[PDB]
């Protein structure tokens, strides 16, 4: 079976402009495991992005945390771009400091 | 520690 | 204060060229401690928690030997299942296996598990009594027949009730500084006007461990689910977890709403109410 990714984009610590932080993109509930996840900075892909080792939940669906060190600003826009077989087109989730 | 022997399906 | 050790294995066939991608991760409760990625350069089981690095060379050599043996079994399994399901050799398929044990508050074996999935669905699983198998379909049924004849359950049961628990207790001791420490959620509420008449109260639970937690909203002392939203618990990335629950309320009536946080790290549940 296939299961579409649930996605959450958020910072590890409370967002504070000028202060170093970590931008996370947690993808979960998906199957199969092949997935494309990129963190974007103003629409552009970030290169120094790492991800957790593939694991899965009780229902067998996979979850992965993609993250990169970053320093938020009032202007810079961040988001997570996810592409999975279950998706017609790559899904983009904008980072909201309040969520 | 991992299990030692794993039986094939 | 129950605990668990679990190993997750995922093998994905790659018909275009080469062997299956194999990734194994080991966890004690919600803390990953080892991993093996067939794609990695080391080709060794690797530490992912400081407390496991204490283990000597023999440990790493043995875990590596065993995990490589596991990857090969999965490789074979992918082929076997392809046949059982009469599937094409051109498609990519996935076999997953998870197993481990739990120790109860008494620190003794509580339960064991060993289940397998093919393409994201239950294939075969050891039952709670660790003596019988649950086969989801006739492919799994054939595996079940073979495993019953080979007495696989007995062998697994020995590991699950013995070795598994013994090592779990060993890791718990070795990494007690974190593994036997609960990190109570750091909580706070934020307020966001969504209109002139409505506001969103968001109740945050941050940097907690373990991941299990419950956030509930009450309006005037009674649970409220309508007008609410709770995100799935997510990893902060530093080993802790985060979660929040929100409720839309009439502006000015924020005081009627309370957020309730239940977590193992909290002697008594926390109750938050907007300023």
List keywords for this structure.
heterotrimer, A: mainly beta, 5-stranded antiparallel β-sheet, 4-stranded antiparallel β-sheet, B: about 10 residues, little secondary structure, about 0% strand
Q: What name does the CATH topology of the largest domain in chain C carry? A: Murine Class I Major Histocompatibility Complex, H2-DB, Chain A, domain 1
What global shape of chain C is seen?
A: globular
CATH topology of chain A: Immunoglobulin-like
**CATH homolog superfamily of the largest domain in chain C:** MHC class I-like antigen recognition-like
Percent range of helical residues of chain A: under 10%
Percentage of residues assigned to helices of chain C: 10-25%
Number of domains of chain A: 1
User: Could you tell me how far the N terminus lies from the C terminus of chain A, measured between alpha carbons in angstroms?
Assistant: 30 Å
Please outline the major beta sheet of chain A: 5 strands, antiparallel
Derived from helix and strand composition plus strand pairing, the structural class of chain A reads mainly beta
Under CATH at level 1, the class of chain A stands as: Mainly Beta
Q: Largest beta sheet of chain C: what is the strand line-up?
A: 4-3-2-1-5-6-7-8
Largest sheet of chain C: 8 strands, antiparallel
**Domains of chain C (count):** 2
Q: Which oligomerization state do the chains in this entry correspond to?
A: heterotrimer
Return the string of H and E elements of chain C: EEEEHEEEEHHHEEEEEEEEE
Region (Alpha-3) (chain C): 183-274
GO molecular function (chain C): beta-2-microglobulin binding; CD8 receptor binding; peptide antigen binding; RNA binding; signaling receptor binding; T cell receptor binding; TAP binding; TAP complex binding
Family (chain C): Belongs to the MHC class I family.
Disulfide bonds (chain C): 101-164, 203-259
Account of the 3D structure:
- Chain A has a single domain (1-99), classed as Immunoglobulins (Immunoglobulin-like).
- The N and C termini of chain A lie far apart (30 Å).
- By secondary structure, chain A is mostly beta strands.
- Chain A is built from no helices and nine strands.
- Chain C is α+β, with helices and mostly antiparallel strands and 275 residues long.
- Chain C has two domains: 1-181, MHC class I-like antigen recognition-like (Murine Class I Major Histocompatibility Complex, H2-DB, Chain A, domain 1, 2-Layer Sandwich); 182-270, Immunoglobulin-like, CATH 2.60.40.10.
- Chain C is 24% helix and 40% strand.
- In chain C, the strands form three sheets. In chain C, strands 4-3-2-1-5-6-7-8 form an eight-stranded antiparallel β-sheet. In chain C, strands 9, 10, 13, 14 and 15 form a five-stranded antiparallel β-sheet that branches. In chain C, strands 12-11-16-17 form a four-stranded antiparallel β-sheet, with no helix packed on it.
- The longest helix of chain C has 28 residues, at 57-84.
- Chains in contact: A-C, B-C.
- Chain A binds chain C through residues 1-3, 6, 8, 10, 12-13, 22, 24, 26, 28, 31-34, 52-56, 60-62, 65, 67, 98-99, and chain C through 8, 10, 12, 23, 25, 27, 32, 35, 37, 48, 92, 94, 96, 98, 117, 119-122, 190, 192, 202, 231-232, 234-238, 242, 244.
- Chain C: It is a single-pass type I membrane protein.
- Chain C: Residues 183-274 are annotated as: Alpha-3.
- Chain C: It is found in: Cell membrane; Endoplasmic reticulum membrane.
């Amino acid at each position: 079976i296939q299961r579409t990714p649930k996605i959450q984009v958020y910072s590890r610590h409370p967002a504070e402009n000028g202060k170093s932080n970590f931008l996370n993109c947690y993808v979960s509930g998906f199957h199969p495991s092949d997935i494309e996840v990129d963190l974007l900075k103003n629409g552009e892909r970030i290169e120094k992005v790492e991800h957790s080792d593939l694991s899965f939940s009780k229902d067998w669906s996979f979850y992965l945390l993609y993250y990169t060190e970053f320093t938020p600003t009032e202007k810079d826009e961040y988001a997570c771009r996810v592409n999975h077989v279950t998706l017609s087109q790559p899904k983009i989730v904008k980072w909201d400091r309040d969520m | 520690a991992l299990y030692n022997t794993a039986a094939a399906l | 204060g129950s605990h668990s050790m679990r190993y997750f294995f995922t093998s994905v066939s790659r018909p275009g060229r080469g062997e299956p991608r194999f990734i194994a991760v080991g966890y004690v409760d919600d803390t990953q401690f080892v991993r093996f990625d067939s794609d990695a350069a080391s080709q060794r089981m690797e530490p992912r928690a400081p407390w496991i690095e204490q283990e000597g060379p023999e440990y790493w050599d043995g875990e590596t030997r065993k995990v490589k043996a596991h990857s090969q079994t999965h490789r074979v399994d992918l082929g076997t299942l392809r046949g059982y399901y009469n599937q094409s050799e051109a498609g990519s398929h996935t076999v997953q296996r998870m197993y481990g044990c739990d120790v109860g508050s008494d620190w003794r074996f509580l339960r064991g598990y060993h289940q397998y999935a093919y393409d994201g669905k239950d294939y075969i699983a050891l039952k709670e009594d660790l003596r019988s198998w649950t086969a989801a379909d006739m492919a799994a049924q054939t595996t079940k027949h073979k495993w019953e004849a080979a007495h696989v359950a007995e062998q697994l049961r020995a590991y699950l009730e013995g070795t598994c628990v013994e090592w779990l207790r060993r890791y718990l001791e070795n990494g007690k500084e974190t593994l036997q420490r609960t990190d109570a959620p750091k909580t706070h509420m934020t307020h966001h006007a969504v209109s002139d008449h409505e506001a969103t109260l968001r109740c945050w639970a941050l940097s907690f461990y373990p991941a299990e937690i419950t956030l509930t909203w009450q309006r005037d002392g009674e649970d409220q689910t309508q007008d609410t939203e709770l995100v799935e618990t997510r990893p902060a990335g530093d080993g802790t977890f985060q979660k929040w629950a929100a409720v839309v309320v009439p502006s000015g009536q924020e005081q009627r709403y309370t957020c309730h946080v239940q977590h193992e790290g909290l002697p008594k549940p926390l109750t938050l109410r907007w300023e």
